[PDB]
Design a protein around this ligand. Structure first.
Ligand SMILES: Nc1ncnc2c1ncn2[C@@H]1O[C@H](COP(=O)(O)OP(=O)(O)O)[C@@H](O)[C@H]1O
Lengths: 68, 444, 67, 67, 159
């Protein structure tokens, strides 16, 4: 929201998936991810624009199912 | 891509021509199916040359038996079966490109778009893109120039231009689409494509009819809305081309256009640099535009356009060639717009030169000098000051103006002191000069 | 030294038109702080030469050979 | 030691790494030749790329070729 | 919506109010009609307050804007096109054409009045550089207004 809705982001981008992580990703990385979600070979911020920076930085530490 | 497993060169050699004879007029589709099975066998064996030959044979059979519809779904099935071998499909499109260009027909437009749909699935920069460019250019020629296909060729060029271009073929393709874009009379997109391609220069040193053609299509684009400085810059960029190819008519008319444009451009420091650089040209003297440029460039003359339309306005009626002049001012609608653009351009020029000469000028005289009334003169005077071009203050009730900034007493006494020191230095220099000349003059 | 290198290449002030190309032999022993995206944008593994690639290299190496 | 690069051969003299060659082109040449496209994109160019693998790949040849 | 309301009243920056208003309207997507109408009205009011009415046409042409289109929405579009023309009279005409639709004191009448003052100040300042001394009824003629209101505005600026 600082960069106003990620500079006019699309609806189908919600942070439900890339944040329920349990993979640290400190606020500095969060700000970097916000500023790196910027591949825009077109007009506006979209989903395909994201997926380059949205599939990049994938979340390694996992396996909470054994604990739950 | 992948290593060949089982070759069938002997099988295709002994069977394909026999299959062609068995289906000379193409009435049999079992022959098509059995070669599909054969090329599938070679495809599973990862052989490229055999599959390519089969596809070339299949389309060749469709050419000779002229089944246009069955060709459409046949090539659709071939390109969509499993995508086969990229070398083979790239080949098959190439002979399809070679064939669609020789038969005019009505549904070749359907053939062109069908292959376009087959190649637009991706794999553009990789595995042949010049075919798609040729098909789009072929579509342009078939529809004889419209807006839909001009948009299509607009949205196609970018991928291949960035990926794999040609110093002649690609730029001509760019030149052949911007003219259609200008024919559509779209200005924002045509400006965008022109400015994104003109960054690729340093090939024009060997141009024949390419840089001039590019420029002569972007002359109309710029001058359509408001451009007058870029107009003179690329009209002199087409003036230096007859320097290496000396042809008199185009050369002289280019000189007439650039001289008229460079003066007509709004006043700025850069325009002053161009007019001074243009002036003094040895080859520019033999045209009446030489007298026009010499008069209207410097020495702050009263540019009464009512007098100029007959003193130097002969280019409108009759000159040496008068072909650019008739294009500029001899036109009816756009010509009268440029006539008004000359009418005002000399008004700001007259205001500007009056600014550096006259401090306070009465309203009647200034309006008479501007060839307008009081309200029109004050309206343009307001137009200059809002642009910060001139330092003007007017008393509207009194109708009197001033151009000198109020001198602050600090710097007022400073220039007085500088004037004093200049006098003091002059006393020192004169005293040394006269005393020494006194010494020489009394050596007797 | 590693911390100074990290805070001078990423740090607070970034570089402009400057690209770093680096190579090594043990990717696992590398510090995870350096290899995070933002400092190393792309990771490329140069694999074993292909059999036809080896053929081309052999031809290149056997160019000026009397045979 | 950074201005004494020995006379090398062209980067086209090593085969099987054309993908790595175009990776080097679109990380070095592209950002500086055409900033207008990326301006329409509105993004910063990437910073660096990593090469790793068996000790014999051609990394020194590629580094010397680009040098 | 409230955060955008507070930021809009703070007036230091309006672009962040645009983000908050859009998020509120995004939360009100065909769920609560009166709250959605207020959110989009506030969203477009701060958008025109950013002095960029060019994006208004795209914003009002959006699918959600057309879904929640109304007389108040059209009035704001007319206000935006008045800002395009830089005509304080056109803004005043649009306000009178839809008065009860935009008579709301909270961040509706206040901001429209503030914007109206901005155009008045900008129009006066734009036409005042040439004149060292100009008669004020001529100034009223250029601005296309009466004499008392122009004199009152020019005074309040100079006091
Ligand atoms: N792909 C290749 N093409 C041609 N020559 C190669 C290749 N890979 C290695 N070489 C040979 O290896 C030597 C270069 O060493 P190199 O493998 O580049 O070191 P490193 O892998 O540590 O960068 C040269 O003599 C060169 O002939």
């Amino acid at each position: 929201s600082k960069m106003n809705l990620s500079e006019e982001v699309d609806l189908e981008d919600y942070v439900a998936r890339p944040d329920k992580i349990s993979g640290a990703d400190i606020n500095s990385i969060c700000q970097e991810s916000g500023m790196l979600a910027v591949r825009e070979n077109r007009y506006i911020v979209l989903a395909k624009d994201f997926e380059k920076a949205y599939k990049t930085v994938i979340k390694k530490d996992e396996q909470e199912h054994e604990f739950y | 891509i992948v290593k060949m497993e089982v070759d069938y060169s002997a099988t295709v050699d002994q069977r394909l021509p026999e299959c062609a004879k068995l289906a000379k007029e193409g009435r049999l589709q079992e022959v098509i199916e059995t070669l599909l099975s054969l090329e599938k066998q070679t495809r599973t064996a990862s052989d490229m040359v055999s599959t390519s030959r089969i596809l070339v044979a299949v389309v060749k059979m469709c050419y000779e038996a002229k089944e246009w519809d069955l060709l459409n779904e046949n090539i659709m099935l071939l390109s969509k079966r499993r995508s086969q071998l990229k070398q083979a499909v790239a080949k098959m499109v190439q002979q399809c490109c070679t064939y669609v260009e020789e038969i005019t027909d009505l549904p070749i437009k359907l053939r062109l778009i069908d292959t376009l749909r087959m190649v637009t699935e991706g794999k553009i920069y990789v595995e042949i893109e010049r075919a798609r460019l040729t098909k789009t250019l072929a579509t342009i020629k078939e529809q004889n120039g419209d807006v839909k296909e001009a948009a299509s060729i607009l949205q196609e060029l970018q991928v291949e231009t960035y990926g794999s271009m040609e110093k002649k073929e690609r730029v001509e393709f760019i030149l052949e689409q911007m003219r259609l874009c200008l024919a559509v009379k779209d200005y924002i997109r045509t400006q965008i494509i022109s400015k994104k391609i003109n960054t690729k220069f340093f090939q024009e040193e060997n141009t024949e009819k390419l840089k001039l053609k590019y420029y002569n299509l972007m002359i109309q684009l710029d001058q359509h809305e408001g451009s007058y400085l870029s107009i003179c810059k690329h009209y002199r960029a087409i003036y230096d081309t007859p320097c290496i190819q000396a042809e008199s008519e185009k050369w002289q008319q280019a000189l007439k256009s650039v001289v008229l444009y460079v003066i007509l451009a709004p006043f700025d420091n850069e325009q002053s640099d161009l007019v001074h650089r243009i002036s003094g040209d040895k080859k520019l003297e033999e045209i009446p535009k030489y007298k026009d440029l010499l008069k209207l460039f410097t020495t702050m003359e009263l540019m009464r356009w009512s007098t100029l339309v007959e003193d130097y306005g002969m280019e409108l009626r009759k000159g040496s060639l008068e072909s650019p002049a008739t294009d500029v001012f001899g036109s009816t609608e756009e010509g009268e717009k440029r006539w008004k653009d000359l009418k005002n351009r000399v008004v700001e020029h007259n205001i500007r030169i009056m600014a550096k000469y006259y401090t306070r000028i009465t309203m009647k005289r200034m309006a008479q000098l501007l060839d307008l009334s009081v309200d029109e003169s004050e309206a343009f005077l307001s137009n200059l000051v809002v642009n910060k071009t001139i330092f003007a203050k007017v008393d509207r009730l009194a109708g009197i103006i001033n151009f000198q900034r109020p001198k602050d007493p600090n710097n007022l006494l400073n220039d007085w002191s500088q004037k004093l020191n200049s006098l003091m230095s002059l006393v020192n220099k004169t005293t040394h000069l006269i005393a020494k000349e006194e010494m020489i003059h009394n050596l007797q | 030294t590693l911390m100074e290198l990290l805070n001078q290449m990423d740090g607070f002030d970034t570089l402009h038109r400057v690209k770093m190309i680096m190579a090594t032999n043990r990717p696992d022993t590398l510090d995870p702080a350096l290899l995070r995206p933002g400092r190393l944008d792309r990771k490329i593994h140069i694999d074993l030469p292909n059999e036809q690639a080896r053929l081309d290299i052999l031809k290149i190496h056997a160019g000026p050979i009397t045979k | 030691m950074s201005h004494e690069d020995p006379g090398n051969v062209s980067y086209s003299e090593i085969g099987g790494l054309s993908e790595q060659i175009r990776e080097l082109r679109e990380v070095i040449e592209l950002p500086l030749t055409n900033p207008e496209l990326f301006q329409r994109v509105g993004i910063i160019p990437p910073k660096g790329c990593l090469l790793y693998g068996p000790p014999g790949t051609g990394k020194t040849l590629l580094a010397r070729a680009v040098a | 919506m409230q955060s955008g309301i507070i930021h809009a009243a703070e007036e230091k920056d309006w672009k962040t109010a645009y983000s908050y208003f859009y998020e509120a309207f995004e939360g009100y997507d065909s769920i609560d009609s009166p709250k959605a109408i207020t959110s989009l009205k506030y969203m477009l009011l701060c958008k025109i307050m950013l002095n960029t009415p060019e994006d208004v046409q795209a914003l009002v042409s959006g699918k959600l804007a057309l879904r929640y289109a109304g007389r108040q929405t059209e009035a704001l579009k007319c206000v935006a096109q008045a800002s395009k023309n830089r005509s304080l009279a056109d803004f005043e005409k649009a306000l009178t054409d839809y008065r009860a639709e935009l008579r709301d004191d909270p961040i509706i009448s206040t901001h429209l009045a503030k914007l109206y003052d901005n155009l008045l100040e900008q129009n006066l300042i734009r036409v005042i550089e040439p004149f060292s001394r100009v008669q004020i009824e001529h100034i009223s003629s250029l601005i296309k207004l009466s004499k008392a209101d122009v004199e009152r505005k020019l005074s309040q600026m100079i006091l």
